[PDB]
Design a protein around this ligand. Structure first.
Ligand SMILES: CCCCCCC/C=C\CCCCCC(=O)OC[C@@H](O)CO
Ligand SMILES: CCCCCCC/C=C\CCCCCC(=O)OC[C@@H](O)CO
Ligand SMILES: CCCCCCCCCCCC[N+](C)(C)[O-]
Ligand SMILES: CCCCCCCCCCCC[N+](C)(C)[O-]
Ligand SMILES: CCCCCCCCCCCC[N+](C)(C)[O-]
Ligand SMILES: CCCCCCCCCCCC[N+](C)(C)[O-]
Ligand SMILES: CCCCCCCCCCCC[N+](C)(C)[O-]
Ligand SMILES: CCCCCCCCCCCC[N+](C)(C)[O-]
Ligand SMILES: CCCCCCCCCCCC[N+](C)(C)[O-]
Ligand SMILES: [Ca+2]
Ligand code: NA
Ligand code: NA
Length: 403
């Protein structure tokens, strides 16, 4: 299989990203994502290319999603390889990195020890100032399916931010500086959708230090507008804890707790994620990756506390369903929260961000095809005040064909 084609037909429904407090924030659009790919393997050499042709109801583009060359001949370890090019950098939680980026990444994956060491930097986004990311991890499977690892991420950004009044696109920097994340992780089939254990867990504690400049934004008629900048020394903490009960081979239910520290005049104790994260994982124990902090809220571990309750059902490799409840609060009731899904203004003094009920339902067909519903229903809390819509939703219907 030197080539193939993924055809994703998606329908997104977004109402309303600003909770009905600003013009914009709505979507009811369809799109086609055509991802031709080319994989070649000549011994220890392996080259891959994935293209992307997207047309949505406007947003019409072409991109080189992945383009890498890989060398596996440094060591006899079949899990050891050096990947160079625009590659997928993903760790199981999606909380450090889950993105396609030009990187020089070294993997060493053995049953007892896992180790990664890479450098990533965007030179383009290959669609129709910069940041250096330096990272590494070392984990040990101390007991079957039980892991304990330390993870490091450094972001070097000598760049600058959009000035107050200017608009901020998604391709823009929201932060600069020198930031080191040092995390301690322990997992027991944390993201294993087919687990041999009645209990799965994840437990992560991360320390963020450094110098950081970061944007403070607002929304002005569907446009993200820079309102200023926080310039400080960072000393922040992030935590994610979860327990998943595998009631049986189909039924799962679990609890989660995460906290991304918040606060400080210039965000001294405000935790943040690397900016390479997707926050998508199989934390509900299904094949379907669910947004860890709601499909609607799209929380980013930054001045955020999240309590999660989830129920899931996986039928063989045919069906999966995940019902996810989250309650969101800020740590500091005068700081902004990390969210990629809600841009509505927050009323100072109010900790209660909201509540969310997510449903992810997928039907798989070997017919190489899947029909997925990923939807978040967010109930705005007191932090967003009165006048807001009683609820917000983001729902997607994906129809994927893999050839
Ligand atoms: C083009 C409009 C944007 C799409 C918004 C999503 C529509 C939301 C709800 C209505 C459809 C409900 C059924 C979803 C579906 O077909 O997937 C479920 C299926 O995979 C397994 O039962
Ligand atoms: C050998 C034992 C392994 C455990 C070592 C891993 C834990 C190390 C450090 C935890 C980071 C805590 C940082 C303490 C801190 O908040 O100091 C900042 C303070 O000066 C400002 O309030
Ligand atoms: C920019 C380098 C990575 C992109 C290359 C895409 C992988 C295919 C390599 C071309 C050779 C194919 N083959 C096997 C037919 O010889
Ligand atoms: C060994 C060198 C391999 C050369 C193959 C080059 C493949 C890249 C294809 C460019 C496609 C870019 N885009 C954006 C138009 O899709
Ligand atoms: C095969 C195509 C290679 C694409 C260039 C990737 C540049 C990555 C460099 N680095 C080390 C900064 O990540
Ligand atoms: C064996 C190559 C992998 C190296 C990856 C780096 C792992 C992170 C360890 C950071 C060191 C911090 N400290 C204070 C714990 O020593
Ligand atoms: C061995 C790595 C796992 C460490 C995770 C445990 C973190 C401590 C839990 C307390 C959470 C409370 N708080 C307020 C600090 O967020
Ligand atoms: C809210 C998420 C946590 C729910 C998990 C509750 C534990 C499983 C209860 C089922 C126990 C019955 N049993 C023994 C037949 O398995
Ligand atoms: C025009 C399309 C409208 C899409 C409506 C879908 C709302 C998202 C539902 C999230 C799941 C929560 N639940 C269980 C209450 O349905
Ligand atoms: Ca609106
Ligand atoms: Na190797
Ligand atoms: Na599971």
């Amino acid at each position: 299989k030197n080539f193939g084609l993924d055809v994703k037909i998606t329908g997104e429904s977004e109402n309303d990203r600003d909770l009905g407090t600003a013009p914009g924030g709505t979507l009811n659009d369809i799109g086609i994502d055509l991802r031709p790919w080319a994989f070649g393997q000549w011994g220890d050499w392996s080259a891959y290319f994935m293209g992307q042709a997207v047309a949505a109801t406007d947003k019409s583009y072409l991109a080189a999603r992945e383009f890498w060359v890989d060398y596996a001949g440094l060591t006899a370890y079949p899990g050891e390889h050096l990947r160079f090019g625009r590659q997928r950098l993903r760790e199981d939680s999606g909380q450090w990195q889950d993105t396609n980026i030009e990187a020089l990444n070294w993997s060493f994956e053995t049953t007892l020890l896992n180790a990664h060491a890479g450098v990533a930097q965007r030179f383009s986004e290959y669609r129709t100032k910069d940041r250096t990311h330096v990272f590494g991890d070392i984990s040990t499977q101390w007991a079957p399916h039980h892991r304990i690892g330390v993870r490091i991420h450094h972001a070097d950004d000598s760049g600058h931010l959009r000035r107050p009044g200017e608009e901020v696109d998604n391709l823009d920097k929201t932060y600069t500086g020198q930031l080191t994340w040092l995390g301690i992780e322990a997992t027991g089939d944390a993201y294993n959708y087919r687990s041999s254990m009645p209990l799965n867990y994840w437990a992560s504690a991360t320390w963020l230090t450094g110098d950081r400049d970061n944007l403070t934004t607002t929304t002005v008629d569907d446009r993200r507008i820079a309102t200023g900048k926080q310039s400080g020394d960072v000393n922040a903490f992030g935590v994610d804890l979860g327990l998943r009960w595998n009631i049986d081979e189909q039924w799962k239910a679990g609890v989660g707790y995460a906290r991304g520290s918040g606060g400080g005049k210039d965000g001294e104790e405000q935790f943040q994620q690397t900016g390479l994260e997707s926050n998508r994982s199989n934390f509900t124990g299904t094949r379907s990756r669910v947004h860890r902090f709601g499909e609607a809220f799209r929380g980013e571990l930054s001045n955020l506390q999240a309590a999660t309750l989830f129920g899931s059902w996986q039928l063989r490799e045919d069906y999966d369903a995940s019902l996810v409840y989250h309650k969101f609060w800020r740590v500091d009731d005068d700081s902004d929260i990390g969210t990629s899904g809600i841009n509505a203004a927050l009323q100072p003094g109010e900790k209660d961000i909201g509540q969310e009920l997510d449903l992810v339902v997928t039907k798989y067909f070997k017919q190489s095809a899947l029909i997925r519903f990923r939807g978040g229903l967010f109930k705005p809390g007191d932090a967003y005040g009165p006048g807001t819509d009683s609820t917000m939703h983001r729902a997607f219907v994906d129809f994927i064909w893999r050839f």
